[PDB]
Amino acid sequence: ATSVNERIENKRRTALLGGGQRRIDAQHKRGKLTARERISLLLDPGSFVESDMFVEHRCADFGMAADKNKFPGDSVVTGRGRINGRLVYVFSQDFTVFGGSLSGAHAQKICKIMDQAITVGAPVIGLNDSGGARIQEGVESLAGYADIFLRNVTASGVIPQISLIMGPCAGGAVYSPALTDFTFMVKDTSYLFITGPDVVKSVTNEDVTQEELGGAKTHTTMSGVAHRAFENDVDALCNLRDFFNYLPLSSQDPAPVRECH
Amino acid sequence: YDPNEKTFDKILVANRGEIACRVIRTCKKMGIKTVAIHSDVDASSVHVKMADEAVCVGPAPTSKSYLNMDAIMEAIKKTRAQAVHPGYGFLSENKEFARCLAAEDVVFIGPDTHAIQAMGDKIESKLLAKKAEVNTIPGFDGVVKDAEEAVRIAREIGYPVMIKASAGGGGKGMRIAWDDEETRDGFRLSSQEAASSFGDDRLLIEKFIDNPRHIEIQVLGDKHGNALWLNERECSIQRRNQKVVEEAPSIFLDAETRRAMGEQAVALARAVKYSSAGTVEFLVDSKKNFYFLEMNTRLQVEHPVTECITGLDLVQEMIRVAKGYPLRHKQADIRINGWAVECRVYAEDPYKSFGLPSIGRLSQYQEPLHLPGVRVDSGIQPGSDISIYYDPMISKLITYGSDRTEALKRMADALDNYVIRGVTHNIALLREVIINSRFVKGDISTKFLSDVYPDGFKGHMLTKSEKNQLLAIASSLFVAFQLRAQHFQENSRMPVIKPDIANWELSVKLHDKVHTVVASNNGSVFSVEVDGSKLNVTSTWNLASPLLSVSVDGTQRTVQCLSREAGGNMSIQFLGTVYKVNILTRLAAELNKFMLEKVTEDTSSVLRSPMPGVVVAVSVKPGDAVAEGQEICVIEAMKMQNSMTAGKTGTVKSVHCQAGDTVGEGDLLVELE
Amino acid sequence: DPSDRLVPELDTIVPLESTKAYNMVDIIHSVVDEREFFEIMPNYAKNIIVGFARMNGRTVGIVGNQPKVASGCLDINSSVKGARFVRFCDAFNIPLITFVDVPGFLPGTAQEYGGIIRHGAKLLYAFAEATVPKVTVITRKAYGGAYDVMSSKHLCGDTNYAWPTAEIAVMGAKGAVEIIFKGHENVEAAQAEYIEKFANPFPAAVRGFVDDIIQPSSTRARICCDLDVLASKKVQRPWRKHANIPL
Ligand SMILES: CCC(=O)SCCNC(=O)CCNC(=O)[C@H](O)C(C)(C)COP(=O)(O)OP(=O)(O)OC[C@H]1O[C@@H](n2cnc3c(N)ncnc32)[C@H](O)[C@@H]1OP(=O)(O)O
Ligand SMILES: Nc1ncnc2c1ncn2[C@@H]1O[C@H](COP(=O)(O)OP(=O)(O)NP(=O)(O)O)[C@@H](O)[C@H]1O
Ligand SMILES: *C(=O)CCCC[C@@H]1SC[C@@H]2NC(=O)N[C@@H]21
Ligand SMILES: [Mg+2]
Known part of the structure; x- marks a missing residue:
């Protein structure tokens, strides 16, 4: 008798529920969904293939060795799928697991997805909502960001890259969306800034809050970082589908041609 | 340097800079562990990394770092040191420090408290010297209290009058007024000045010796009643009452006068019961009459120049005497061996009041240790800092020879081959003084710098031949840089076509004058025509070394290129002075009149x-x-x-x-x- | 000018206390041949210094941070100033030498409204795209994503060195303590232990992010040898007409 089969079910039901039901309820109260249903609405039904769902971080500092800080998947869902019959690779961050803060396994999964996409020649779509780099790793988070930036720069001009900011992205995670072709926003829930308002309090001593600091209005009206803004998440994802229906899979292919009337 | 004899095992050096390094080296050779104090800004000093162990004593200011007795005592107690060497300055003539050290357990390398107290004031010193049958400056004993008493004294002592502020001093608080109105106003203003500085306000009246010479007799004593005088020294080149250039034997003195002065100094030392190294200073008029003036109860700044002609190590003798051993020499065994000259290199601008302090960080530093008969005492290494809290003295340069001329020539060469980049120094003054006609002849006095340059130091005035040599060297260097600029590697796609210019015609602007120069190159030899004059310049033409040695008409010269910029401005250090020159091509010079x-x-x-x-x-x-x-x-x-x-x-x-x-x-x- | 000349002037140029500032131009002059340096844009965006120099006779481009101005923080102007120079040097097969002392990016509302993200992306892409040999030396500080922007080992860098006074972290100790040890509400011992364990270049060395920890006096002799080895470096990249600059 081996428990190597009930372990699979326990790990899967933990991964499908993220970091707990309380965090899911808190996310829903804020008007935000979770990663897996964004993936489901973004892709065609019955076409999503997940990868690296059993990858775990390796930290052994500041008490993460306990099981209470042990989460399968490591705050990211990565896979491949089809939109209107055309291949694409997708990754999303889970805000329930340490606020989506990136670690070694997170960066490794993103890097494997990007490597597969550049090898086969398929576009990349990223749904970003993460709090930055997790401190207790140290330099490995910086190495992960550097690797993501390197692969973003290498694939530039070869395959298209798209990003949706669906939540507060702060710290060094704001540079991957800036290195892609297009950047989109979701109003009233998405933010983008280098540092929080507390540092502004400390150094500049002037009154400002988060909304005009890094809100969608600021970046779509007087900053020039984002391209468009959307009312909510479902409309944003439908518009992303429609937009992706416009552009080709690679620079080696001609511009798409559709049926006309 | 026999290590068999037992001496202290751990000595703490309560000073900084050159003297600290010198003492550390002397103890290291003689086999004694060392301890070095420092401040927060001195954490990266030369002496700190040269000695075992270190103890920070406080912040940057001298009042809290090197004059803080409590911190020094704590450091001595913690480090378990057995003896302390104060060096010179700071707590070297302070009787409280010596009293405390003698009180606790510690042996203080220097004179006892009684000698320091006796030779501390300018009143008791004169009475003691007069009791010791030593010639003294004519004057009146007792502090003057009113101007009427001062002028009353002034009639009998003679019209020239020197009024002096008792205690303190150290190069300040002196005025030479002779008129009765000048007498009273100087009395008042010197009283208020003394109140501002040290507050005792005691003043003395004495005859002002005119055209004097300063002669220092170095004396060495022990705790067994022995005393020696280690020849004399001549220190007359001063600005702001501080010496710059010192000469080991006195060319102005013969054997009999030297013996008389030495015997008088030894008699004074026996009278005060001196038991360490010290110096006695005399003022000598033109008629070879010497008067006693001050006795320093500590090591002298210019001590090494008397070690060259004697062959002793003074710091070792002080330590051995402090242990208790008697002296191992006799007066007959002390002899003059050669000649020696010592120069003090400061961090100051010599063009303002014969020296004005400056700050900075040193980017390059090289000493001429390979030259014959050259010794350097420095507390500086590349990357050192100059703070606004301490004496800006950078180095001491000593040269020795078999006679005056050889020592002077070696000193000039060493000054030419000395590299300091990062701050401003007084090397130009030091090099120009040692070639003055009067200094070479031997007719100098205390006011030598105050009448050779009535308007102040302007630089080295170069003659026509030296001007031509400088112009030729500058033109040769410019053309050498231009030639070096044309050497590329092989391209194999577009070959380089070197120009075949035969003669370079240049316009050279120096001061407020313009000269025309024609330069030709024949390998490693440049032929230069300066306004008709013909010269040949040959050298290895290494454009990266800080020092460049060239040969102009057989004469060997050493020059340095301080700075160079594409517009044509160059700075060349040549015979000590820095000349700024502007070199242009003739065509470019023609077109520069339209700007x-x-x-x-x-x-x-x-x-x-x-x-x-x-x-x-x-x-x-x-x-x-x-x-x-x-x-x-x-x-x-x-x-x-x-x-x-x-x-x-x-x-x-x-x-x-x-x-x-x-x-x-x-x-x-x-x-x- | 020999390539193995020692430079003991740099052994103590970096102050021990982190509040004081130093001049990077002194280090640059000490390292390069004949102490000759041609600086580009010397009076604009003075918190970054870029220029041309010669190393063993070969032309090199130099990029560095200036802690004298704005404590070395990056901003909108310096990002473009560095990016254009780096792109030019990469285009014409000129090696790059970098001196890193950066606390991060300059905070404020004017910088945010001006589009600091775009210009940070400019500099990041400019360093990541380069295929010429590149050598980096870390002097004092490398904090956060800025360390990633300054040609780290992870952007296909060639050789990375750190001086014994260097130190790399995500940010300062106080921020890490206040973001990690919040429940403990005791920052007395926490800050001391954190600065004792992580305020040093060893965490980056043990993972192999920096090749060696070198004495400053041997910096120049270390660089020249590297430029003799990396002169024949060649790399291959996927085909494309051109990439998408964040312009
Ligand atoms: C290399 C680049 C860098 O140096 S990035 C340094 C990190 N900079 C930061 O400002 C901290 C990051 N966090 C944030 O900015 C805010 O939390 C943002 C993202 C705006 C979210 O807003 P807010 O709703 O108030 O946060 P929250 O109360 O829901 O916190 C939920 C949990 O998420 C965690 N979290 C967040 N970011 C990180 C991070 N970088 N590293 C590690 N953990 C992070 C928080 O610890 C928090 O934990 P908990 O579950 O509430 O116990
Ligand atoms: N009667 C005097 N006549 C002429 N000059 C005098 C006379 N008395 C003192 N001086 C000058 O004093 C200068 C030397 O300084 P001095 O009086 O010996 O002690 P100090 O200035 O306080 N410093 P120090 O000797 O190093 O402890 C000499 O250069 C003299 O010009
Ligand atoms: C103070 O920090 C400077 C050290 C003390 C210098 C002393 S004072 C008297 C001697 N004369 C001189 O020029 N240096 C010695
Ligand atoms: Mg004197």
């Missing part, structure tokens, strides 16, 4: 600070009208206070300096119309 002169909005009316430091006193306020010849404000930095003068009349629109402010070099202070 409008850049208007400069600086014609006096600006009182920017000539030195960095802290301003403490300001004598004017904005909106006032000033006149000529009065000071505006005083800045204190590097053991020195300086007040800028006047000479133009205007109204002070604003003042940018207040008491306690910190001002850098060249910062504007007073604006006026």
Whole structure:
């Protein structure tokens, strides 16, 4: 008798529920969904293939060795799928697991997805909502960001890259969306800034809050970082589908041609 | 250097800089562990990393770091040291420190408390010397209290009068007024000055010796009643009452006078019961009459120059005497062996009042240790810093030979081959003094610097031949750089076509004069025509080494290239002085007469600070009208206070300096119309 | 000018206390041949210094931070100033030498409204795209994503060195303590232990992010040898007409 089969079910039901039901309820109260249903609405039904769902971080500092800080998947869902019959690779961050803060396994999964996409020649779509780099790793988070930036720069001009900011992205995670072709926003829930308002309090001593600091209005009206803004998440994802229906899979292919009337 | 004899095992050096390194080296050779104190800014000093162990004693200011007795005592107690060497300065003549050290357990390397107390004031010293049958300066004993008593003394002592502030001093608090009105006003203002400085306000009246020479007899004593005089030294080149150039034997003295002075100094030392190394200073008039003046109860700054001609190590003798061993020499065994000259290299600008302190960090530093008969005592290494809290002395350079001429020539060569980059130094003054006709002849006095340059130091005035040599060297260097610029590697796609210029025609601008130079190259030899004159310049032409040795008409010369820029401006150090030259091609020179002169909005009316430091006193306020010849404000930095003068009349629109402010070099202070 | 000349002037140029500032131009002059340096844009965006120099006779481009101005923080102007120079040097097969002392990016609302993200992306892409040999030396500080922007080992860098006074972290100790040890509400011992364990260049060395920890006096002799080895470096990249600059 081996428990190597009930372990699979326990790990899967933990991964499908993220970091707990309380965090899911808190996310829903804020008007935000979770990663897996964004993936489901973004892709065609019955076409999503997940990868690296059993990858775990390796930290052994500041008490993460306990099981209470042990989460399968490591705050990211990565896979491949089809939109209107055309291949694409997708990754999303889970805000329930340490606020989506990136670690070694997170960066490794993103890097494997990007490597597969550049090898086969398929576009990349990223749904970003993460709090930055997790401190207790140290330099490995910086190495992960550097690797993501390197692969973003290498694939530039070869395959298209798209990003949706669906939540507060702060710290060094704001540079991957800036290195892609297009950047989109979701109003009233998405933010983008280098540092929080507390540092502004400390150094500049002037009154400002988060909304005009890094809100969608600021970046779509007087900053020039984002391209468009959307009312909510479902409309944003439908518009992303429609937009992706416009552009080709690679620079080696001609511009798409559709049926006309 | 016999290590068999037992001596102390751990000695703490309560000083910084050159003397600290010298003492550490002497103890290291003789086999004694060392301890070195330092401040927060001295954490990366040469002496700190040269000695075992270190103890920080406080912040940057000298009042809290090197004059803080409590910190030194704590460091000595913690390090379990057995003896302390104060060096010179700081707590080297302070009787409280010696008393405390003798009280606790510690052996203090130097004279006892009684000798320091006796040779501490300018009153008891004179009476003791007169009791010791030593010739003294004519004068009146007892502190003058009123101007009437001063002038009453003045009639009988003679019209020339020297009024002196008792105690303190160290190069300040002296004035030479002779007139009765001058007598009373000097009395009042010197009283208030003494009150400001040290507050005792005791003044003495003595005859002012005119045209004197300063002669120092070095004496060495032990605890068993023995005394020796280690020949004499001649120290007459002074500015601000501080020596710069010292000479080991005195060319002005013969055997009999030297013996008389040495015997008198030894008699004084026996009278005060001196039991360490020290010096006795004399003033000698033109008629070979010597008068006693001061006795330093400590190691002298210019001690090494008397070790060259004697062959002793003074720091070792002091340590052995402090242990208790008697002297191992006799007066008959002390002899003169050769000749020696010592120069002090400071960090100061020699073009302002014969030296004005400056700050900075050293980018390059090389000493001429490979030259024959050269010794360098420095507390500096590349990357060192110069702070505004301490004496800006950088190095001491000693040269020895078999006679005066050889020593002077070696000193000039060593000064030519000495590399300092990062700060401003007084090497130009040191090199130009040692070639003066009067100094070589031997006719010098205390006011040698005050009448050779009535208007101040301007630089080395170069003759026609030296001017031609400088022009030829500059042209050769410029053409060498131009030739070096043309050497590329092989391209294999577009070959380089080297130009075949035969003669380079150049316009050379120096001071306010323009010369035409024709230069030809024949390998490693340049043929230069300067206004008809023909010269040949040959050298290895290494454009990266800091020092460049060339041969002009057989004469060997050493030059340095301080700076170079593409517009044609060059700075060349040549025979000690830095000359700024502008070299252009003849065609470019023709087209430079069409360029409008850049208007400069600086014609006096600006009182920017000539030195960095802290301003403490300001004598004017904005909106006032000033006149000529009065000071505006005083800045204190590097053991020195300086007040800028006047000479133009205007109204002070604003003042940018207040008491306690910190001002850098060249910062504007007073604006006026 | 020999390539193995020692430079003991740099052994103590970096102050021990982190509040003081130093001049990077002194280090640059000490390292390069004949102490000759041609600086580009010397009066604009003075918090970064870029220029041309010669190393063993070969032309090199130099990029560095200036802690004298704005404590070395990056901003909008310096990002473009560095990016254009780096792109030019990469285009014409000129090696790059970098001196890193950066606390991060300049905070404020004017910088945010001006689009600091775009210009940070400019500099990041400019360093990541380069295929010429590149050598980096870390002097004092490398904090956060800025360390990633300054040509780290992870952007296909060639050789990375750190001086014994260097130190790399995500940010300062106080921020890490206040973001990690919040429940403990005791920052007395926490800050001390954190600065004792992580305020040093060893965490980056043990993972192999920096090749060696070198004495400053041997900096120049270390660089020259590297430029002799990396002169024949060649790399291959996927085909494309051109990439998408964040312009
Ligand atoms: C190399 C680049 C860098 O140096 S990035 C340094 C990190 N900079 C930061 O400002 C901290 C990051 N966090 C944030 O900015 C805010 O939390 C943002 C993202 C705006 C979210 O807003 P807010 O709703 O108030 O946060 P929250 O109360 O829901 O916190 C939920 C949990 O998420 C965690 N979290 C967040 N970011 C990180 C991070 N970088 N590293 C590690 N953990 C992070 C928080 O610890 C928090 O934990 P918990 O579950 O509430 O116990
Ligand atoms: N009667 C005098 N006549 C002429 N000059 C005198 C006379 N008395 C003192 N001086 C001058 O004093 C200068 C030397 O300084 P001195 O009086 O010996 O002690 P100090 O200035 O306080 N510093 P120090 O000797 O190093 O402890 C000499 O250069 C003399 O010009
Ligand atoms: C103060 O920090 C400077 C050290 C003390 C210098 C002493 S004072 C008297 C001697 N004369 C001189 O020029 N240096 C010695
Ligand atoms: Mg004297």
